[PDB]
Design a protein around this nucleic acid. Structure first.
Lengths: 714, 714
DNA sequence: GACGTT
DNA sequence: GACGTT
């Protein structure tokens, strides 16, 4: 093991993260020190760097020293920490390209090699920058220095950057200076910049001289300099009235601009000239402003025709929600628009008029309308749009499947579904109706127009499933989530019909998780098409106490590949039950039951079983027969049990075993005799009271597989 | 330790339960064996009893051998077990009074001492009884023998009891013979019986000769002999039509009868003569019959005037729910009635007419109306009743506090509360509105008529709490449960006003548990009256990351005694936070957070703290200073952490410490040096990998306090 | 110094 | 025999 206590990985990277080290490990001389190209020392306890820490690292290109010595405000305990660096610490490494010194209490910029390409000094204690700090860094392309004077990392004044301090850096393209209490753009920046992030300072005034000779700018973030603290979740200083102040020419010379962020700048309107001169503008973030009235009447969206993404979120009135909301005619052009975000504006009624302008935009794929407090939604409207893939109407008060037409209505106040809500939505493939108030008796009459519907999420509701023909109007339905509808199912003395599963010809995924199903339920679940059933969070235990009434509950699911029986209060698991389970099963999850014993031999009953998960049960040991012969098991999880010992040879027969999780048990050793091993690719043996005086050799033979604390003896 | 492996307790009882013993521990000769009056050997592995097992137990009066050798059907694994008993096993104990042999595969009744007063042979393998089996048991007062021939413990035939087999038992008062596949009452029973339980057999016919000369009967259970399997949750054989058959004189000679159970006897009506002759009848269970039409028209409730409890539940029609439901006029008399249970009949409308008959009954305290599928409920009706203490309308579709007027509406489909629902309910003191669909903006206008309301449970709803005057119409409200309303609180970018707490002058208990409160919330909670706040299941962690905005969140709760911050994702807990917490605190719960460190000294900041709960966190050890001086802590729970060691003297200063829970950690010893001990009353050191070769002496000195497995070495 | 997966 | 808090 060449680099203890650190870990050798591919791409010449050495991981020393989270080892609570007090200094940089020099490593023994015999190591291949020239081979290391990357060294990560994240979140250690290193408060002092030395000339000799990285000197022998001959091909070091990436170095990460993040979170070693956080300033008092960023320290979880608020411990002050001052990181000292010897003069030639990094000069000693003339190959160094990527240096991250963020979340470290250093007070000035150290001497750096001229090879450095990227430097992060974010959340450090550096309050001053001059030209001398960046002498001869001709390769430096990225400079991060966010968060050096703000509420979480305070300074009595602000970050000071002298005029032309970075002007000598001719290769610099990326510059971030957020949360530094600035009151103006630092003067004379390198014209090479393409990204400039000055957000969350207090640059409350702006002219073209502030962005002077920065003609290569591609992205410009200036938001949060003039904030609306009514919407703030963190410390916030309100923007004075009669601010902010810009003037038309500010951005006119930025012809290469593609992204402009003006969020949280207390804007009641925009000024055309700002944009007239930005012909390349793709993404515009106007969120958290006061543009509620502006967007109803504005004509500025004409000749913003190259715009692709537009964020208008939280442009809400302080005290009210609007009755209606009509978008200006100018939104119709906007022919390049792909994503429109209008969440958090607050309007109660969504109609045909509301989104009239947007109806003909040929590329509009995403419309975000959540958190608007909408009571009434005319959903047929969405059938009119040519390119719509995602409509989010979640968190309102209305009353695979990435990359197909999806409508998210979750977190609304729907009580009954009527089929007339889905007029014009025959194209819809995925519908989320999660977290509603739906108490309807679903009887095959709710979703009739939704003929393309492939996914229906109805979790977190009160659906009463007594009719045998529930969801029968969706024979093309592939996935149905009926978890967290426990209120109907937990009714005592009331029956529950699950026969409808048999009536859904193309259903592949079903969830009945967390329903508390425990008695008076259908005796058999039948389906030829179902591949995965989540039956977690039920009381299969109590069902299997009721004689043999429920012995063949899953048997009728003929082609079932995955079954989840986690959290079913199972104190025991007979060969009986396993034998009457579909023989097609490749994955069986049994997490967090109450199993103190497990007949391993009876696994033979499931010849196809590749994945078994017994985590969180109460196994005291691995014994009572080994893993049986012929077993196809590639993944086994027995973590968080009380496993105190393992019978010799216990795993051996698992010829396929790839991943084994033994963590959080009561093991005092790890013996090879348990396996026959080399094959094994993941061996998790963490959180075990390991005694430390058989494994030291064995564990180091198979170190590539092992991703490991002693409990003994001090 | 006189009785290892068993445990000596008060009342001369020796606990040997759940020790997986293979035989009865004889104990060393030196023990005070004459002092033991009771021996419990529940759920051990004892399949063989011997003459010498209890011979030295000179004053044994109670013996429990339950669950030692369960029959195949009752065995969790379905292991057959046959329990052998030597002839004089119990004869060897002439003082024996109470013998429980239930859940043991014995095939005949053993020889028993004449001192025996109570005997249980339930769920054993005894299929025959004769007079010889009970020779000379003149004291025998109680005989249990339920469940010896039924689905969970099958026999090919039935239990056979010869005529007059128990007739020699002149002191016998209690007899249970349920689930034994009987087809008639066993003939000539002792006239001394006062309780006779024959339920769940198949006694489908009944005449007075079956209860011949049993004039001292006080309680008679004959239900489930003639069942309706449509409502059954377990194996069930339907009752043939033209059955059951009784005739008027069956019960006429039972003048001392107080309780009659006729549940699940497929009754479409009752026959007067059955009851005409039972002047003492207090409790009548008619549940699971077909009495839906009978109770609308019957006149039998006249001259059932001494009846106190009446169960009519699940008297429902197979395929339907009734539109209305009018109770017969005869219910009005019935002047002795205290409890009426009418759940599971299924009717959609509850009106003034429905319960008209009951309106004037002077003692009616409990009316159970849950699980009826009621859509419309005229709640003012209940204001008319003179003695009503509990009305349960839970699990319907409507659209301290034991011993005061309570209305449970939980598990209905209420979306908005209107004050006009509570007209006439000014007397109501407790209201459960849990698990509804309530999405209302509570603004001080919902509960106006409820002037006596002391308890309001509004958990599991979607209450939006934005108005500062929510619940302001209840200034007398003492307890408010607002847990599991996370949908409003988890809305991102939306504020949440908790100022209303300050506006409730007499509020003592508040629950905000499991709301996901994490940001944009009131900065301070103020209240002079609040004594306990449950703030579990929130994100106080994220709130306390947002600078010092939330440093004084609980401070304004001036007289707060109990605070629950369990499950708040707390990775750390500064002296800061503790210091800005009410100084009145006696209980602080922090279960199941992510705390890997704890500054114990900073407990000094809470001088009144008697109870601290740190269970389920991630403490690796008890160190970093001991419990600080002056600490008033009487209960400390650090179970289910990863505590590997304890600094010496760690507890010492906790002069008051009464209860300490150390279970489920990584301890290898238990040292006295941790304490200074004698005071300590509960010391839980279970589920710890204890090494076993300092504690053996110490733990036995303080054995009275300790209620303990080795993990080492085999 | 310590703390902690930010 | 074993299993498990029924």
């Amino acid at each position: 093991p060449a680099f203890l206590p650190c870990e050798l990985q591919p791409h010449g990277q050495v991981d020393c993260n989270w080892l609570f080290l007090k200094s940089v490990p020099h490593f023994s001389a015999g190591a291949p020190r020239a081979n290391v190209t990357s060294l990560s020392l994240i979140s250690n306890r290193i408060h002092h760097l030395h000339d000799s820490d990285f000197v022998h690292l001959s091909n070091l290109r990436v170095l990460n020293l993040k979170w070693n010595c956080p300033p008092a405000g960023l320290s979880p305990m608020h411990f002050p920490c001052r990181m000292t660096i010897e003069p030639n610490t990094f000069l000693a490494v003339p190959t160094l390209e990527e240096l991250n010194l963020s979340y470290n209490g250093i007070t000035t910029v150290p001497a750096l090699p001229s090879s450095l390409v990227s430097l992060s000094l974010s959340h450090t204690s550096i309050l001053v920058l001059g030209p001398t700090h960046f002498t001869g860094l001709h390769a430096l392309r990225f400079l991060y220095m966010d968060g050096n004077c703000y509420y979480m990392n305070p300074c009595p004044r602000a970050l000071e950057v002298a005029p032309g301090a970075l002007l000598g850096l001719g290769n610099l393209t990326h510059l971030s200076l957020k949360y530094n209490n600035l009151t103006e753009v630092p003067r004379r920046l390198p014209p090479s910049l393409d990204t400039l992030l000055l957000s969350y300072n207090h640059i409350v005034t702006l002219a073209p001289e502030d962005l002077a000779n920065l003609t290569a700018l591609r992205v410009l973030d200036v938001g949060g300099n003039c904030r609306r603290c009514d919407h703030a979740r963190n410390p916030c200083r309100e923007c004075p009235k009669n601010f902010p102040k810009l003037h038309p020419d500010t951005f006119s010379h930025l012809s290469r601009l593609e992204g402009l962020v003006l969020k949280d700048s207390s804007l009641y309107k925009l000024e055309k000239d700002w944009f007239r001169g930005l012909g390349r503008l793709q993404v515009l973030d106007l969120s958290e402003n006061f543009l509620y009235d502006y967007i109803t009447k504005t004509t500025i969206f004409n000749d913003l025709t190259q715009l692709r993404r537009l964020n208008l979120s939280f442009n809400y009135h302080k005290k009210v929600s609007f009755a209606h909301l009509h978008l200006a005619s100018s939104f119709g052009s906007l022919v390049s628009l792909e994503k429109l975000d209008m969440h958090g504006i607050f309007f109660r009624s969504l109609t045909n008029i509301t989104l009239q302008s947007l109806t003909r935009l040929p590329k509009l794929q995403s419309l975000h309308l959540q958190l608007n407090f909408i009571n009434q939604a005319q959903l047929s409207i969405f059938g009119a749009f040519p390119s719509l893939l995602f409509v989010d109407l979640s968190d309102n008060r209305i009353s695979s499947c990435n990359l197909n037409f999806t409508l998210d209505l979750s977190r609304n106040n729907l009580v009954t579904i009527q089929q007339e809500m889905f007029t014009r939505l025959s194209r819809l493939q995925c519908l989320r109706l999660s977290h509603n108030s739906i108490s309807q008796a679903v009887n095959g009459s709710q979703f009739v127009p939704l003929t393309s519907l492939r996914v229906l999420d109805l979790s977190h509701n009160k659906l009463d499933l007594y009719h045998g023909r529930s969801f029968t109007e969706l024979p093309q339905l592939e996935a149905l989530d009926l978890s967290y509808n426990s209120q109907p199912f937990s009714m005592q003395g009331v029956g529950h019909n699950l026969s409808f599963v048999a009536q859904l010809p193309s259903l592949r995924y079903l969830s009945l998780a967390h329903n508390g199903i425990h008695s008076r339920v259908s005796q058999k679940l039948s389906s030829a098409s179902l591949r995965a059933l989540d039956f977690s969070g039920n009381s299969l235990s109590q069902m299997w106490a009721e004689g043999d009434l429920y012995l063949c509950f899953f048997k009728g699911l003929r082609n079932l590949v995955q079954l989840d029986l986690s959290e079913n209060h199972l104190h025991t698991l007979l060969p009986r039950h396993l034998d009457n389970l579909p023989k097609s099963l490749r994955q069986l999850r049994l997490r967090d039951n109450n199993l103190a014993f497990f007949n391993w031999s009876s696994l033979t009953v499931l010849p196809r079983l590749e994945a078994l998960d017994l985590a969180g049960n109460q196994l005291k040991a691995l014994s009572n027969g080994s893993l049986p012969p012929g077993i196809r098991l590639q993944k086994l999880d027995v973590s968080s049990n009380s496993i105190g010992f393992v019978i010799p040879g216990f795993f051996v027969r698992a010829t396929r075993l790839i991943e084994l999780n033994l963590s959080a048990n009561a093991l005092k050793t790890v013996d090879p005799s348990w396996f026959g091993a080399g094959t094994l690719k993941i061996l998790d043996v963490s959180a075990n009271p390991l005694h430390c005086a058989a494994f030291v050799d064995f564990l180091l033979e198979r170190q590539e597989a092992v991703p490991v604390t002693c409990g003994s003896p001090g």
